[PDB]
């Protein structure tokens, strides 16, 4: 099965360099062009560059001709993007794609995307998360994760073995210029004094991975 | 730039057959294949159609899409609650020497019956009141439609300007939404003021609700 993974996201200041990586797996990459797409938080689609299976041939969009720099090695499955000279309007999501057709020098089809990596183009600086408990027929309880920079986070609970009624709400921006958000689940109140819940929260821009135990209070 | 326009929004119940129409130009549409791409809430896009009409395997054969001069159409058979997400065609463009034009996107909403909302309140954690900020934070649970009055009153005065709401995509299972909504006050403003309170009027209940603690208890 195929896969592909984007890396290289995180925040990064205007005017300043950023290089993105793609890792491919499942299908022979040396035979298929690859594409970038990218998308800003909240909107549409828009192609970014493509280069065919040996580089030989390469496209960029008009938005980025003379600034970015799209480059691949067959002997490692990976794909590249060299970005220079970053303004605001290229926070995106950078997703990596294969195409349908082999051995191909024209166009693009998308066939596979990777879930993309997220590039935040910002003044402000990297900070980690707060992560504070929203304790408790149905009860509910959550985190707070508050205060953090750029997006994202995840969240799960009890490291995955808890999905039934998670609701892990849009992150929104506060006036202070930092995200929050909040992440919480309802569950049987007769388990309150039984099941454990913890909130592993993760953001990768700071390296930061938090198990938050939630508890009702006294 | 160009775009292929598609209609911001389509909608259908359940098991009823939705459209998602995308016009072009004879440059892009009228001289190439057009893909479709179906983008759920938190995931990238997933090829959904390619050469017009052509499914991958793995895509249901309630998917269909066709071409007709410079026009696209997506109809989506038999509507699952699954089905709602944005969906985007695309298709290469001749004019300029080449360029990849994607359209503008549909959201597709699943129609239900209205649902009132379980509200939950959670006063701040002490933890996090020990670093001078109290975020008091009011939870709608699954809820239809989107549209909600969601009010704070703190010793019965109205608050403004210092809440923040947001707001889930549709579930994929049950096609209800939830809300958030945070309360933000200096540890010294919390300090000095007894009821917190978060009213809730919405479409599904006939009075709005009030869920509400005092401070310390």
């Known amino acids: 099965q195929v896969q592909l993974v984007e890396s290289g996201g995180g925040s990064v200041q205007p005017g300043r360099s950023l290089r993105l990586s793609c890792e491919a797996s499942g299908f022979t990459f040396e035979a298929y062009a690859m594409h970038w797409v990218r998308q800003p938080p909240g909107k549409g689609l828009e192609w970014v560059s493509s280069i065919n299976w040996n580089s030989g041939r390469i496209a960029y969009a008009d938005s980025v001709k003379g600034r970015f720099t799209i480059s691949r090695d067959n002997a490692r499955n990976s794909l590249y993007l060299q970005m220079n000279s970053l303004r605001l309007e290229d926070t995106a999501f950078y997703y990596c794609?294969?195409?349908?057709?082999?051995?191909?020098?024209?166009?693009?089809?998308?066939?596979?995307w990777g879930q993309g990596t997220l590039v935040t183009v910002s003044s402000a600086s990297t900070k980690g998360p707060s992560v504070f408990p929203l304790a408790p027929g149905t009860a509910a309880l959550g985190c707070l994760v508050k205060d953090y920079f750029p997006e994202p986070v995840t969240v799960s609970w009890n490291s995955g073995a808890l999905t039934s009624g998670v609701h892990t709400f849009p992150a929104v921006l506060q006036s202070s210029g930092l995200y929050s958000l909040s992440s919480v689940v309802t569950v049987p109140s007769s388990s309150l004094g039984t099941q454990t819940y913890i909130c592993n929260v993760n953001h990768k821009p700071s390296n930061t991975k938090v198990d938050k135990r939630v508890e009702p209070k006294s | 730039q160009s775009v292929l326009t598609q209609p911001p929004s389509a909608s259908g119940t359940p098991g009823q057959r939705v459209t998602i129409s995308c016009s072009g130009s004879?440059?892009?549409?009228?001289?190439?294949?057009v893909y479709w791409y179906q983008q759920l809430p938190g995931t990238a896009p997933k090829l959904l159609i390619y050469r017009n009409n052509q499914r991958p395997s793995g895509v249901p054969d309630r998917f269909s899409g066709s071409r007709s001069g410079t026009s696209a159409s997506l109809a989506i058979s038999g509507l699952r609650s699954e089905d709602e997400a944005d969906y985007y065609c695309?298709?290469?463009?001749?004019?300029?020497?080449?360029?990849?034009?994607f359209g503008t996107g549909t959201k597709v909403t699943v129609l239900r019956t209205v649902a009132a909302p379980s509200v939950f309140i959670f006063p701040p954690s002490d933890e996090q009141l020990k670093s001078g900020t109290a975020s008091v934070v009011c939870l709608l649970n699954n809820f239809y439609p989107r549209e909600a009055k969601v009010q704070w009153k703190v010793d019965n005065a109205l608050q403004s300007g210092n809440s923040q709401e947001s707001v889930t995509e549709q579930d994929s299972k049950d096609s209800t939404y939830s809300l958030s909504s945070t309360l933000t006050l200096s540890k010294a403003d919390y300090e000095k003021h007894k009821v917190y309170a978060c009213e809730v009027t919405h479409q599904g209940l006939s009075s709005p609700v009030t869920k509400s603690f005092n401070r310390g208890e």
């Open positions: 004879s440059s892009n549409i009228g001289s190439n294949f």
């Open positions: 695309a298709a290469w463009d001749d004019s300029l020497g080449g360029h990849y034009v």
């Open positions: 794609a294969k195409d349908i057709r082999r051995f191909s020098t024209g166009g693009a089809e998308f066939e596979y």
